[PDB]
Write a protein that binds this ligand. Structure first.
Ligand code: CA
Ligand code: CA
Ligand code: CA
Length: 318
């Protein structure tokens, strides 16, 4: 594993040229959504920021206010996601799950499960800088119970460092998890939230081995993904991220298209948020694990400029 994304710095970029092109495409009645799509999906995020800066000095206009007026639908919500400064997209996405749009634990479980404690400190820092309130307090307001408790544990970003691995506490933790999991994760929540939340990744992947020997099964089996119980799902997410974030994230995209529905808000979020970080890796797991390329799935569930961009993000190569 070399963490890679799918979007890189466009070579021989001209932020002025870029911005002018993008002025013609809005310009007049009609929109050149292809021209808009192809350009910004073929640019990285920092670059997109230079083009907004250039669009303003040139024309005296707000690039994003113009995109927000020209566009609709999901291709709008996609473009608008592209133009989010990477530093912000996650906390933007946390804010909105918390504002308005009622019950959105799916989003909270996704980010806070699947970010590295270095990602979690910055998010907390930026949100509290952008929106004025603390993420942790906002989460406490809008959540309840152990699901809340666990998130607030996860939000501390304070796991045991990977160092020496204590085979005795690996035995003790896999016990606690054994029994609690045939208690339906339904008893002694305080005890398992401390193990899931504070232990090291390298310690936990060992505990998870130590379960599959003692119980003959792997700890996932003991939960249902379809059935609710935010905690169980949060639990389940942690067990999958502790094993492998790009694999968790490739499974999140895969059930975003499963059945009736394409859960576009999950689609947009992952593609975009991981695009310059690990989107490569997420492909190279989806293929192998789900046996179809991500590309073609998306080419399949989606349609329009929205799938043009999305495919353009994904990249048809490896
Ligand atoms: Ca127009
Ligand atoms: Ca709400
Ligand atoms: Ca579908």
């Amino acid at each position: 594993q070399v963490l890679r994304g799918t979007v890189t710095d466009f070579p021989g970029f001209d932020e002025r040229a870029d911005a002018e092109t993008l002025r013609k495409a809005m310009k007049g009645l009609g929109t050149d959504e292809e021209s808009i799509l192809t350009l910004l999906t073929s640019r990285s995020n920092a670059q997109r920021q230079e083009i907004s800066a250039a669009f303003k000095t040139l024309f005296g206009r707000d690039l994003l206010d113009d995109l927000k007026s020209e566009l609709t639908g999901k291709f709008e919500k996609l473009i608008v996601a592209l133009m989010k400064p990477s530093r912000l997209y996650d906390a933007y996405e946390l804010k909105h799950a918390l504002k308005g749009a009622g019950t959105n634990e799916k989003v909270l479980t996704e980010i806070i499960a699947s970010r590295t404690p270095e990602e979690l400190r910055a998010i907390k820092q930026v949100y509290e800088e952008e929106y004025g309130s603390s993420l942790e307090d906002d989460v406490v307001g809008d959540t309840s119970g152990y699901y809340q408790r666990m998130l607030v544990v996860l939000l501390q970003a304070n796991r045991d460092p990977d160092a020496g691995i204590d085979e005795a506490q690996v035995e003790q933790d896999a016990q606690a998890l054994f029994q609690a999991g045939e208690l339906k994760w339904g008893t002694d929540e305080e005890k398992f939230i401390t193990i899931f939340g504070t232990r090291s990744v390298s310690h936990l992947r060992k505990v998870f081995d130590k379960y599959m020997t003692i119980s003959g099964f792997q700890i996932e089996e003991t939960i249902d993904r379809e059935t609710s119980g935010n905690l169980e799902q949060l639990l389940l997410a942690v067990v999958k991220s502790i094993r492998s974030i790009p694999a968790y994230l490739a499974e999140t995209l895969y059930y975003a298209m499963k059945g009736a529905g394409t859960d576009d808000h999950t689609l947009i979020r992952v593609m975009v948020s991981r695009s310059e970080i690990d989107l490569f890796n997420i492909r190279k797991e989806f293929r192998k694990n789900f046996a179809t390329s991500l590309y073609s799935m998306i080419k399949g569930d989606t349609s329009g400029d929205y799938k043009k961009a999305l495919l353009l993000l994904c990249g048809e190569d490896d």
